[PDB]
Design a protein around this ligand. Structure first.
Ligand code: CLA
Ligand code: CLA
Ligand code: CLA
Ligand code: CLA
Ligand code: CLA
Ligand code: CLA
Ligand code: CLA
Ligand code: CLA
Ligand SMILES: CCCCCCCCCCCCCCCC(=O)OC[C@H](COP(=O)(O)OC[C@@H](O)CO)OC(=O)CCCCCCCCCCCCCCC
Ligand SMILES: CC1=C(C/C=C(\C)CCC[C@H](C)CCC[C@H](C)CCCC(C)C)C(=O)c2ccccc2C1=O
Ligand SMILES: CC1=C(C/C=C(\C)CCC[C@H](C)CCC[C@H](C)CCCC(C)C)C(=O)c2ccccc2C1=O
Lengths: 137, 73, 163, 73, 73, 82, 721, 80
């Protein structure tokens, strides 16, 4: 799948809060989320309250990644809305995470790679052993 | 008075340490296979017996010692 | 952004996704003008000069409390020599300043301070930070503090107002 | 008792507000921490609380054991 | 008077031993957490799943016994 | 509305709050301070001077007439059993 | 779970049983139908009123048959008020003690005896009737709830008409209620009590109804009643001033407020609530739309404001419950501090045992209700807050700068804590090192509360100057040189304020601010937080969200009420302590023939309450001697409950310092022993839930702690007063 | 960061994924069960370690196990 990319989009109406980005964004990382609304609706917005959704591309910048998903998972419910978020970084860069595969993680997809799958089954783990590793490899 | 009270608290904490390095032995250094069906490995296979009777003995002592006291008051 | 806003609480510098807001306390010309001035602020000025202002002011301020509420309030012998105490504090306070300055190195990638004003002018750097800059500033504080201390004692060790 | 009754999630959320504060306070912005301010861990608090509990336990009785006995002899 | 207190102490011993051996015999795991062996002597917990798993490590069982030890002494 | 990957700074609270002031300077009296505050500007050297300045505390306590270090005199209590 | 079908379903674990009671009254979790809920709670209030009505019936009944009220009436100064008697079983009869009047019973502190004398009640016959009348009402109230849930339940539209409800409640209940009681006073209370103060004896008093029928008996005293036409219709009103006055102060013979004033009070209160009753809009035109007026207020700072409030407070019970609990609790507190300073009952102030227990009881009830406001406010945020349908904007912003409010309130508590408790640690250290000059004391560096001392000063010089009609002061704590002494006891006296009084007030400032902090933090961050962006989806009452993020224990709004619950205890617990010592040390005592007054502890408050050691010795250790030496006497029960509370208290620490993971594993070993002997219950035993263990913990902590002082205080004042 | 593992005792009910708020897990084609899916833990870097996934697992004891390891800003759940 090819990541779509985000360039410029308008931000939803809100007026400000004290739960926004703070320094971490400047020096480590900050996460942005994009979704399209068929109507200028009203959504809760985590770390604050009441913001108008807007109609169009809709671009929002948040922190922790998790804040974006919470909004996104609420965005998929209530309103039938598709969404995507990325990790901006401080020096440009384009890291796109979620959906990623382009199909939701909960929905099985054809070529993902297992990563950290144990075909032993739990309870068959060993006991140390002063060697490196913990046995739940 | 000081010396007795001193050593009893020292003896106290030490006992909790002997009972603390016990579990650590089981988790970090215990080899179940090398200790197959020996006196040590037999403690884990009837552990519910030792614990329950300690519960009973504790519940017994508490129910009456406290009972006899409150009664007297 | 003036002046039919008819409301106060403009989102911080127009950004409503950065935490903080604009309030008279945050941004009032009187406050802003006030904040812009002072040794801590006033970037583009020698750090040593700024420390002196700050250092000198604090040292002078510290004497009053120590002398008045000291263990010898209350004594000719400790008539104000306790100011010595105020001085000791600035000796200690200069250590804390010095050790903190070691969190900034001499490489030093000078300045962790922002590189732009609001209005996003995009111009200039600060320099208070960095090893050389911070050290000068402490030295100023030490100098400023010890002095402020002596002077305040001076007037008191004469006084007449108010006895 | 504070570290034993009150638990972490309350304190962590409290510190997060204090982290915001320090950042938005003039004349204090110039100074920054080198270590991220976080609430004590779940196990750490149980320890720290137990240490307080044990120290006060000993010191109180120590103060009483000596004085009450020393006073009368 | 010496009768009741000796039973109180006997109560203190049994209960403290109950807490300590239970932490030892269940250090490698129980039915609420069969793979406790894989987490070490000291870990915060295993989460609120399966009803809740607060103070389930062998370390915490020690930490609970220290209270009872202080009471006994 | 205004996010620009080009400048990551304005995007964040990178900007110095208007409290910054990069204006002129202060009177020439500085020429004096710069001369006499120099030895304390070195850092590390100052760290030491202040710590060894703790030699003052030793001097101040070795010689101190009015701190309670004397009974002044009394006849001590025996006292519970002598 | 009876309330819900799936909930009722079946029991598989013991957790089902605990859940069943935990969500018994959680009406909004059983249905989403607002009308069904409202119908439920409305009937529930009836069932409540029945219980308190039955409660009243037993108080009047016991006063009639099991009390020495008549005996106390003739000799109120040294007869001990006692209701309820104990059957002579397994050695119980020792709790029946000498209370005077040739009667054996437990001395009481409810204060009903003082209430009954004020009402002009004279015989058990009268108490007997009032008990029955209460039972008759209890039968009604219970029946009324059954009728309004199964026969004729009101529409949701009925409950929503708040305007009509407001007009009535502060006029139909308050106004006429005050007016009706105002009538009983001048017709029954005032005439009969006037006799009682003349030492006429109750049986020699004519019956109340004889005062009403013929004016003759009521007119010889208070001769304004003589005119049949009455000067009321003449609208001069100056003539009436004999039975009602603005005298204030305190009657030097009965030690209570002049009923001569309380009647006038209610007369004013009544119509003041009758006029204010004519405010909101209904059907016949004249009135206000509270919806309209609320909308009008807006501001440069608030933008739209209050718009939408009317919608919120007409569709959400928890919103209304929080507001009501916040002030009903606050009202109970100001009641405690108005009844001590202005004794409204005959021979009330003289009865020290009743006053301590009255003030202390109202402080806890007031304290608890306020904490409950925090809960339902947080419940509203989790369950009823919807910006899409019911935006307010006031609520917004608050949520917008919530990290600000908490951070500041966090600082104030640290400032207060240092500048309160620290001063004591200072004094404790300076006194131990042998330097009292250094301490914060009246004898050394003093911190005089000149502001409070100034307000009191203007209250003293108020009658005549800024209060012409007032002959005497409001309360004698603002008197100046006055002193009321009923019996050989001191009813009241000007209360001084020193440096010792400066410290303790600052401790109350503290404890209240911290309690506010914990509770307010839980309400604002009930839905979202930087730590937990979706806390609202976890609900209001959940244990946590795992050990992740370093640990997220007690992030729920429920747990914030849990933590703030101990602090409300810590708070009041020191208010009542302030009350107890200050009153005993500088107010309560015996007055001699010469006029010399000796207080119970002898003015040791000023220089010994500035030290921590001073409270632990001169207050606790000293004033305990009563409770710990009450064995073999009538106050035997207090000694036991003192020990009994210390236990349920230390019993709470078992639940508070531990977690359920240990207990469940312990049960496993115990279930094994059962399965060996065929004695394993089909309903599998489970440990308490993470949240329940906290609920169990705090209840026992509050019970053992509160109960423990209860026995403290009640043993102290009875043996001494 | 935190260490998460999946076990073949899984039955592919996908509840561990829906529970995660940081998107640490995902479903994978497999031949081991009737669902023919299996959980995967590719993005452990974003794992906070809250064990929401474990409280959704229906397998007799967890098929997904979270082992709290080294702490990072992401794992610490910090927004500052
Ligand atoms: C927090 C409560 C508290 C307070 C108010 C005090 C106060 C005092 N202590 Mg104590 N002490 C305390 C707790 C406290 N102590 C505790 C808990 C202990 C246990 C160890 C002690 C042990 C102790 C000892 C052994 C001694 C004292 C002594 C003193 C006196 C002199 C100390 C001093 O250096 O002046 C203070 C120095 C300062 C630099 C004060 C600066 C603070 C200023 C006022 C802040 C102003 C804020 C301002 C509004 C900022 C914004 C302004 C804006 C407009 C710009 C002073 C009355 C001494 C004494 O009294 O001897 C007889 C003494 O020997 N204390
Ligand atoms: C006259 C007899 C009578 C009968 C046969 C019923 C029967 C019923 N009621 Mg009704 N009810 C009655 C009187 C009666 N009620 C009265 C007088 C009131 C006014 C308070 C109510 C108010 C009421 C409400 C609001 C509801 C019902 C409901 C019900 C149905 C379910 C029962 C239930 O709630 O669960 C439990 C049964 C109990 C008896 C619970 C105990 C509650 C009592 C009052 C406790 C007494 C207080 C106690 C003394 C407190 C001190 C305790 C102390 C010892 C510690 C059932 C058909 C429910 C329903 O319709 O289902 C959806 C329902 O919502 N009732
Ligand atoms: C205005 C009065 C009022 C009303 C009408 C309600 C109503 C409600 N509350 Mg609330 N509450 C109040 C005041 C009030 N509360 C105050 C003042 C506080 C602060 C302490 C609280 C704290 C609170 C919490 C934390 C919760 C509620 C909850 C609820 C809801 C259902 C819970 C339930 O069924 O009870 C269940 C009853 C029990 C479990 C009985 C417990 C045993 C008691 C506490 C022991 C009392 C000891 C006794 C007095 C002395 C010892 C006697 C013994 C030795 C024999 C229900 C809407 C729950 C909710 O989720 O809201 C929807 C919830 O969790 N309340
Ligand atoms: C609701 C509050 C309340 C409380 C806490 C009490 C408490 C008590 N009552 Mg009272 N009572 C009440 C209301 C109350 N009553 C009302 C409204 C009436 C009018 C019908 C009565 C009529 C009454 C009588 C006639 C007696 C009591 C007695 C008692 C005491 C013995 C307990 C008992 O009855 O044995 C157990 C109860 C049962 C086995 C039946 C259930 C006990 C202190 C007895 C007493 O005072 O002892 C000398 C006594 O004889 N009560
Ligand atoms: C003006 C007459 C009047 C009076 C005296 C009352 C009194 C009361 N109301 Mg009602 N109310 C009224 C008008 C009145 N209301 C009208 C016109 C409406 C329609 C909007 C309501 C709607 C309403 C609701 C929804 C509720 C009440 C409730 C209550 C009770 C709360 C307890 C209390 O306040 O303390 C003191 C209590 C007493 C002094 C008991 C009074 C004895 C009876 C009830 C008085 C009968 C009047 C009699 C003919 C004189 C109390 C009995 C609450 C309640 O408890 O539910 C049952 C409740 O939730 N009222
Ligand atoms: C409008 C002028 C007016 C005025 C100033 C009065 C004034 C008075 N009336 Mg009269 N009354 C009036 C008109 C008036 N009334 C009318 C129009 C009728 C019907 C024809 C009455 C029928 C009446 C009766 C039966 C009584 C009074 C009585 C009284 C006296 C009240 C004493 C009491 O106890 O009650 C008072 C002097 C009482 C009285 O006679 O005093 C002893 C008395 O019982 N009035
Ligand atoms: C600001 C503080 C203050 C307060 C709380 C009061 C309160 C009161 N005043 Mg005072 N008054 C004040 C300042 C104050 N006054 C000043 C500065 C003056 C000088 C101009 C007066 C002159 C004054 C007079 C002449 C009277 C009162 C009266 C009253 C009482 C009744 C008020 C009323 O009729 O309806 C609300 C009330 C207790 C009345 C009174 O004495 O009650 C018997 C009365 O007639 N006041
Ligand atoms: C005073 C407080 C207190 C009390 C009474 C207990 C009591 C007990 N603890 Mg505990 N504990 C406490 C504090 C306390 N603990 C604290 C502060 C901690 C540190 C967190 C612990 C940590 C701890 C651990 C780790 C363990 C215990 C265990 C036990 C049980 C030991 C069995 C026994 O000896 O007697 C039996 C019971 C009693 C003596 C008390 C029962 C209470 C009365 C007697 C019951 C009668 C009820 C009566 C009818 C009143 C009815 C009320 C009415 C409303 C219905 C016993 C229940 C152990 C256990 O569970 O063994 C099975 C155990 O594992 N405790
Ligand atoms: C030295 C002794 C002199 C005393 C002065 C200092 C002591 C008093 C403290 C000053 C506080 C300023 C109040 C301004 C009066 C005031 O509150 O103005 C209220 C102001 C008015 O807003 P609006 O005009 O919009 O109001 C109408 C509409 O908004 C509502 O429909 O609203 C705000 O200020 C919003 C920001 C809240 C401000 C938060 C500050 C809260 C202070 C907290 C301390 C409470 C102390 C209570 C003690 C009993
Ligand atoms: C107060 C509190 C905090 C906040 C505690 C913090 C932030 C600890 C910081 C303490 C400050 C730094 C002062 C402590 C000074 C000590 C005397 C340390 C001395 C230095 C060495 C001896 C280590 C928690 O994080 C917590 C977590 C879980 C359960 C309960 C609690 C809890 O009660
Ligand atoms: C002791 C304790 C338990 C165990 C305590 C329990 C399970 C209390 C419930 C036991 C009751 C008393 C047993 C019920 C017995 C039935 C009522 C049957 C009785 C039959 C006759 C005697 C009437 C926890 O589960 C727990 C959980 C979280 C934090 C702390 C703790 C905690 O401290």
């Amino acid at each position: 799948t090819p990541p779509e990319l985000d360039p410029n989009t308008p931000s939803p109406i809100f007026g400000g809060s004290t739960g926004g980005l703070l320094r971490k964004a400047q020096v480590e990382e900050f996460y942005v989320i994009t979704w399209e609304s068929p109507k200028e609706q009203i959504f809760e917005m985590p770390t604050g309250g009441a913001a108008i959704m807007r109609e169009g591309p809709n671009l929002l910048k948040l922190a922790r990644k998790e804040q974006c998903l919470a909004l996104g998972t609420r965005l998929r419910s209530k309103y039938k809305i598709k969404y995507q978020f990325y990790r901006v970084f401080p020096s440009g860069e384009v890291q796109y995470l979620h959906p990623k595969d382009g199909v939701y993680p909960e929905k099985v997809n054809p070529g993902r790679q297992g990563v950290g799958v144990n075909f032993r089954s739990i309870g068959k783990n060993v006991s140390p052993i002063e060697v490196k590793f913990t046995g739940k490899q | 008075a000081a010396l007795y009270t001193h050593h009893q608290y020292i003896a106290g904490f030490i006992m909790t340490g002997a009972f603390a390095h016990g579990p650590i032995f089981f988790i970090r250094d215990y080899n179940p296979e090398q200790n197959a069906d020996n006196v040590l490995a037999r403690m884990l296979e009837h552990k519910e017996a030792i614990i329950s009777h300690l519960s009973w003995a504790s519940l017994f002592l508490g129910f009456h010692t406290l009972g006899l006291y409150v009664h007297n008051d | 952004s003036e002046k039919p806003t008819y409301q106060v609480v403009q989102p911080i510098n127009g950004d409503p996704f950065i935490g903080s807001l604009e309030t008279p306390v945050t941004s009032s010309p009187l406050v802003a003008w006030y904040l812009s001035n002072l040794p801590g602020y006033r970037t583009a000025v020698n750090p040593l000069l700024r420390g002196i202002e700050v250092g000198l002011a604090h040292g002078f301020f510290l004497v009053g409390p120590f002398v008045k509420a000291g263990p010898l309030r209350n004594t000719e012998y400790a008539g104000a020599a306790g100011s010595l105490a105020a001085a000791g504090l600035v000796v200690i306070l200069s250590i804390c300043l010095t050790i903190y300055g070691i969190s900034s190195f001499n490489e030093g990638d000078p300045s962790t301070a922002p590189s732009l004003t609001l209005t996003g002018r995009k111009k200039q750097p600060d320099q208070l930070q960095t090893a050389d800059g911070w050290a000068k500033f402490t030295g100023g504080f030490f100098f400023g503090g010890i002095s402020g201390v002596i002077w305040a004692f001076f007037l008191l060790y004469v006084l007449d107002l108010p006895y | 008792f504070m570290f034993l009754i009150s638990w972490r999630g309350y304190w962590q959320e409290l510190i997060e507000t204090l982290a915001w504060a320090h950042e938005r306070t003039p004349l204090a912005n110039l100074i920054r921490w080198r270590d991220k301010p976080v609430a004590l861990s779940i196990v750490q608090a149980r320890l720290v609380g137990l240490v307080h509990f044990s120290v006060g336990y000993i010191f109180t009785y120590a103060a009483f054991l000596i004085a009450s006995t020393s006073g009368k002899f | 008077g010496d009768f009741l207190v000796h039973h109180a102490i006997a109560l203190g011993l049994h209960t403290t031993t109950l807490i300590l051996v239970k932490g030892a015999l269940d250090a490698r795991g129980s039915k609420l957490m069969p793979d406790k062996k894989d987490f070490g002597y000291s870990f915060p917990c295993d989460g609120p799943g399966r009803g809740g798993t607060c103070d389930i490590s062998a370390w915490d069982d020690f930490y609970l016994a220290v209270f009872w030890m202080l009471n006994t002494i | 509305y205004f996010d620009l990957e080009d400048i990551g700074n304005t995007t964040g609270q990178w900007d110095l709050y208007g409290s910054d002031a990069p204006s002129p300077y202060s009177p020439l009296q500085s020429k004096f301070f710069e001369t006499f505050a120099a030895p304390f500007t070195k850092r590390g050297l100052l760290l030491k001077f202040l710590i060894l300045g703790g030699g003052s505390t030793l001097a101040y306590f070795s010689t101190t007439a009015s701190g309670d270090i004397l009974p002044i005199v009394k006849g001590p209590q025996l006292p519970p059993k002598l | 779970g009876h309330f819900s079908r799936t909930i009722a379903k079946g029991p598989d674990t013991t957790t089902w049983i605990w859940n069943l009671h935990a969500d018994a009254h959680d009406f909004d979790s059983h249905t989403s139908d607002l009308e069904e809920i409202s119908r439920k709670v409305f009937s529930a209030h009836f069932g409540q009123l029945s219980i308190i009505f039955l409660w009243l019936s037993g108080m009047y009944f016991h006063g009639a048959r099991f009390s020495n009220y008549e005996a106390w009436l003739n000799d109120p100064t040294h007869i001990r008020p006692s209701a309820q008697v104990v059957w002579p079983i397994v050695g119980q009869e020792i709790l029946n003690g000498d209370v005077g009047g040739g009667f054996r019973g437990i001395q009481i502190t409810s204060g009903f005896f003082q209430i009954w004398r004020a009402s002009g009640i004279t015989s058990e016959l009268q108490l007997y009737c009032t008990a029955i009348g209460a039972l008759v009402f209890a039968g009604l109230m219970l029946f009324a709830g059954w009728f309004h849930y199964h026969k004729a339940a009101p529409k949701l539209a009925w409950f929503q008409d708040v305007e009509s409800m407001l007009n009535h409640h502060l006029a139909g209940l308050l106004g006429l209620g005050s007016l009706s009681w105002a009538r009983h006073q001048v017709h029954v209370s005032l005439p009969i009590n006037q006799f009682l103060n003349a030492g006429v004896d109750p049986k020699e008093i004519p019956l109340p109804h004889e005062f009403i029928l013929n004016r003759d008996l009521l007119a010889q005293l208070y001769p304004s009643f003589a005119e049949g036409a009455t000067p009321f219709f003449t609208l001069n009103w100056s003539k009436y001033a004999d039975f009602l006055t603005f005298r204030g102060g305190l009657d030097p013979l009965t030690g209570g407020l002049w009923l001569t004033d309380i009647a006038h009070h209610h007369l004013a209160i009544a119509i003041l609530f009758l006029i204010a009753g004519h405010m909101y809009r209904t059907n016949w035109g004249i009135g206000h739309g509270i919806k309209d007026i609320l909308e009008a207020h807006k501001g440069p700072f608030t933008g739209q404001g209050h718009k939408g409030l009317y919608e919120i407070l007409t569709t959400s019970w928890h919103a209304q419950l929080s507001i009501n609990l916040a002030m009903l609790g606050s009202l109970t507190i100001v009641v405690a501090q108005h009844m001590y300073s202005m004794p409204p009952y005959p021979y009330l102030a003289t009865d020290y045992a009743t006053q301590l227990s009255l003030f202390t009881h109202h402080m806890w009830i007031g304290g608890f209700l306020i904490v409950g406001a925090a809960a339902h406010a947080a419940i509203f945020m989790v369950r009823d807050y919807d910006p899409t349908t019911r935006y307010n904007d006031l609520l917004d912003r608050v949520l917008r700068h919530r990290d600000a409010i908490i951070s500041h309130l966090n600082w104030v508590c640290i400032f207060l804590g240092f500048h309160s408790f620290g001063l004591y640690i200072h004094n404790d250290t300076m006194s131990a090192l042998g330097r009292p000059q250094d301490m914060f004391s009246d004898t050394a560096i003093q911190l005089q509360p000149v502001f409070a001392q100034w307000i009191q000063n203007t209250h003293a010089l108020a009658p005549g100057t800024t209060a012409p009609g007032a002959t005497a002061s409001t309360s004698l704590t603002w008197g100046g040189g006055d002193l009321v002494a009923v019996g050989n006891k001191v009813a009241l006296l000007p209360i001084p304020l020193g440096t010792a009084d400066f410290l303790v007030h600052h401790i109350h400032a503290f404890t209240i601010h911290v309690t506010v902090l914990i509770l307010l933090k839980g309400v604002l961050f009930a839905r979202s937080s930087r730590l937990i962006p979706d806390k609202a989806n976890l609900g209001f009452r959940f244990p946590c969200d795992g050990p992740g993020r370093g640990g997220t224990c007690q992030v729920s709004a429920w747990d914030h009420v849990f933590l703030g619950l101990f602090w409300m205890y810590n708070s009041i617990s020191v208010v009542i302590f302030h009350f107890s010592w200050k009153m005993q040390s500088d107010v309560w005592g015996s007055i001699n023939d010469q006029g010399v007054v000796t207080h119970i502890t002898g003015g040791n408050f000023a220089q010994s309450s500035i030290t921590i050691n001073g409270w632990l010795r001169d207050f606790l250790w000293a004033q305990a001697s009563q409770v710990i030496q009450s064995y073999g006497s009538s106050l035997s029960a207090y000694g036991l409950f003192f020990l009994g509370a210390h236990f349920v208290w230390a019993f709470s620490l078992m639940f508070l310092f531990s977690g359920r993971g240990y207990w469940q594993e312990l049960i496993e070993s115990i279930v094994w022993a059962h399965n060996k002997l065929k004695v394993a219950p089909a309903t599998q035993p489970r440990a308490l839930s993470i949240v329940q263990g906290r609920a169990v913990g705090v209840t026992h902590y509050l019970l053992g702690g509160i109960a423990t002082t209860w026995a403290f205080f009640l043993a102290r004042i009875i043996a001494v007063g | 960061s935190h260490s998460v593992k999946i076990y073949d005792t899984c039955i592919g009910c996908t509840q561990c994924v829906r529970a995660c708020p940081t998107d640490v897990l995902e479903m994978i084609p497999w031949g081991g069960c009737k669902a023919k899916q299996i959980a995967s833990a590719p993005r452990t870097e974003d794992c906070v370690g809250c064990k929401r996934c474990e409280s959704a697992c229906p397998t007799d004891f967890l098929s997904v196990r979270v082992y709290l390891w080294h702490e990072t800003t992401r794992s610490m759940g910090l927004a500052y």
